[PDB]
């Protein structure tokens, strides 16, 4: 049932944790002095989320955080990845501090440390203060580097004597893709969209500003706080694996373009100080140019790379064509394929995009090892979902999730035993929670949350982790 996995199967002092994000678990969305984020406005508009649900209450971790910390300690985890809500600290994103918000994160951080659990703190997880969206146009505006740097500075000052493991952003690719290419997440921008936009240009502007903002915040950390605090700052990037459908030159090149457009988009700047060459060749003057000084600030600005790894796809190629620009997604010039030799790549979880493909974990980790000089990587999310409307006991008997983690972690072990510099692994999620457009219809937790009573109940997968992680 453990399949030979234990702490002895991973490197000495490998970090095991679970993950949430602020809007997905906290609740108290319009209480405790918190200002609205772009997701509050989006979720409150009829038809945007499944069942018109929102994160007003969520799991109510805001009031129950000590229960949840005790629970993660009893399951033998070493660390907890959570995010700080920018609008809980600065209701307008700038100016006035909400002291009640500050006290909440102080209390959470202090309790975690009291119970021997290491906090890994994300500054941003999709939840841009609405005031900054309206006043500045959000991530389309280069001024976000200053605005984010001032917010990060406050967080380093206020929490950094205790917090030593920071991330700036969670998955800027998804913000760019869903917010500005397809227009399905806030601010709902795209070429077609009612709010305006341009799917060929805005995704690249947004990504550039995430990178400049990350670099500016880290430069602030390094010049003002690191000497005294001695912590680290990284960034979280999504990476799903792409496998060539066949060994042809065409299909191998398609898979590699997909890798470069997905992960290279951010990794090449963070490691090598430039965008991928293929992106420069295909996107051209729609891709912003780093000045030498900006490139030098961005290069080497992550002390570790967070990887959110879930799934994999086959990629099929074609001849590279001259084309009128339409979108970030169309720029790749690839065809997604989800079967090979008459067999699917894997079975799906509840989320249509989530194909259960354990060898993709090996694919991603090995690729980053071999291509980017083996940087320090943390697996910052990995997990799968159950559907809505099951009984409690059905949720608890999550044998598919047990199998998911045994398989994926075996594949992670394989990459590490071959020399990949992976420092940690974090399971998405500690709790069933608000799953963005799916609302409460998608259950990612190792702990079940009854959303009528808010009671927590560990699933078999939680007990699997407890067995596997015991000292
Ligand atoms: O879809 C499940 C989870 C979300 O709940 C997280 O917020 C997000 O970080 C993410 N990226 C990939 C998968 N997921
Ligand atoms: Zn409450």
Domains and their CATH numbers in the chain = 7-469 (3.20.20.80)
Q: Is the dihedral of CA 5, 66, 83, 150 positive or negative?
A: negative
d(CA 92, CA 36): 8
Q: How far is the CA of 434 from the centre of ligand 1 (A)?
A: 10
**Is 359 marked as binding a ligand?**
no
Catalytic residue among 171, 243, 418, 455: 171
In terms of residues, how long is the chain? 471
Shortest-distance ligand to the CA of residue 174 = 1
Indicate the SS3 state at residue 25. Answer: helix
Catalytic (active site) residue 381? yes
- DSSP per-residue letters across 117-139: -EEEEEEESS--BHHHHHHH-GG
Q: Is 149 close to ligand 1, i.e. is its CB under 6 Å away?
A: no
Experimental method, per PDB record: X-ray
CB of residue 168 inside a 6 A radius of ligand 1: no
DSSP state for residue 431 in the 8-state scheme: B
CA nearest neighbour of 168 among 10, 324, 341, 305: 305
393: CB partners within 8 A, 6+ apart: none
**Nearest alpha carbon, ligand 1 atom 7:** 21
Respond yes or no: is residue 171 known to be catalytic: yes
**How far is residue 411's CA from residue 429's CA, in Å, rounded to a whole number?**
20
| Residue pair 382/428 in contact by the 8 Å Cβ criterion | yes
Q: Are 283 and 197 in contact (CB under 8 A)?
A: no
Atom of ligand 1 nearest to the CA of 383: 2
Cα angle at 304 between 300 and 308, to 5 degrees? 125
CA distance 301 to 216: 9
- Ligand 1 lined by 21 (C-beta under 6 Å): yes
Distance in angstroms (rounded) separating the CA atoms of residues 184 and 179: 6
What are the distances in angstroms from CA 324 to CA 116, 151, 282, 327? 56, 40, 11, 10
How many angstroms does the Cα of residue 93 sit away from the middle of ligand 2? 25
The b-or-e profile of 313-349 (16+ CB within 10 A means b, else e) is bbbbbeeeeeeeeebbeebbbbeebeeeeeeebbebb
Distance from residue 1's CA to the centre of ligand 1 (Å): 27
Q: Resolution limit in angstroms?
A: 2.3
Nearest to 187 by CA among 136, 261, 240, 123: 136
Are 358 and 412 in contact, with CB atoms under 8 Å apart?
A: no
Angle between helices 399-417 and 460-469 (to 10 degrees): 30
């Amino acid at each position: 049932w453990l399949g030979g996995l234990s702490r002895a199967a991973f490197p000495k002092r490998f970090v095991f944790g679970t993950v949430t994000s602020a809007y997905q678990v906290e609740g108290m969305a319009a209480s405790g002095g918190r200002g609205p984020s772009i997701w509050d406005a989006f979720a409150h508009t009829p038809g945007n989320v499944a069942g018109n649900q929102n994160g007003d209450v969520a799991t109510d971790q805001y009031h129950r955080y000590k229960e949840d910390v005790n629970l993660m300690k009893s399951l033998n985890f070493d660390a907890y990845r959570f995010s700080i809500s920018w609008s809980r600290i600065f209701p307008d994103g700038e100016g006035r501090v909400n002291q009640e918000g500050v006290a909440y994160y102080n209390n959470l951080i202090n309790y975690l440390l009291q119970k021997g659990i290491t906090p890994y703190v994300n500054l941003y997880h999709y939840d841009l203060p609405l005031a900054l969206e309206k006043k500045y146009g959000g991530w389309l505006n280069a001024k976000m580097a200053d605005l984010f740097t001032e917010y990060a500075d406050f967080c380093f000052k206020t929490f950094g004597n205790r917090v030593k493991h920071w991330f700036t952003f969670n998955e800027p690719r998804i913000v760019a893709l869903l917010g500005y290419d397809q227009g399905t997440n806030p601010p709902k921008r795209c070429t077609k969209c009612a709010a305006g936009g341009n799917s060929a240009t805005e995704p690249y502007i947004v990504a550039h500003n995430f990178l400049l903002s990350h670099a500016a915040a880290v430069a602030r950390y390094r010049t003002k706080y690191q000497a005294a605090q001695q912590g680290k700052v990284g960034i979280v990037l999504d990476f799903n694996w792409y496998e060539a459908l066949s060994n042809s030159t065409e299909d191998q090149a398609a898979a590699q373009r997909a890798r470069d457009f997905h992960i290279g988009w951010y990794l090449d700047p963070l490691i090598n100080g430039h965008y991928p060459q293929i992106m420069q060749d295909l996107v051209k003057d729609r891709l912003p140019k780093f000045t030498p000084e900006q490139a030098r600030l961005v290069k080497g600005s992550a002390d570790y790379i967070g990887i959110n790894q879930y799934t994999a796809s086959y990629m099929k190629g074609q001849q590279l064509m001259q084309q009128t620009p339409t979108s970030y997604s169309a720029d790749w010039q690839v065809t997604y394929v989800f079967a090979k030799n008459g067999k699917p790549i894997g079975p799906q979880a509840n989320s249509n995009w989530l194909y259960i493909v354990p060898w993709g974990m090996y694919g991603c980790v090995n690729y980053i090892k071999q291509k980017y000089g083996n940087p320090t990587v943390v697996i910052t999310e990995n997990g799968m979902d159950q559907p809505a409307n099951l009984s409690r006991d059905q949720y608890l008997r999550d044998t598919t999730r047990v199998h998911f983690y045994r398989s994926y972690l075996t594949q992670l072990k394989k990459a590490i035993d071959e020399g990949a510099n992976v420092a940690g692994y974090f399971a998405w999620s500690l709790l069933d929670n608000f799953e963005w457009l799916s609302g409460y219809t998608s259950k990612f937790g190792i702990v079940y949350v009854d959303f009528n009573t808010l009671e927590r109940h560990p699933k078999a997968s939680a007990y699997w982790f407890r067995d596997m992680l015991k000292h």
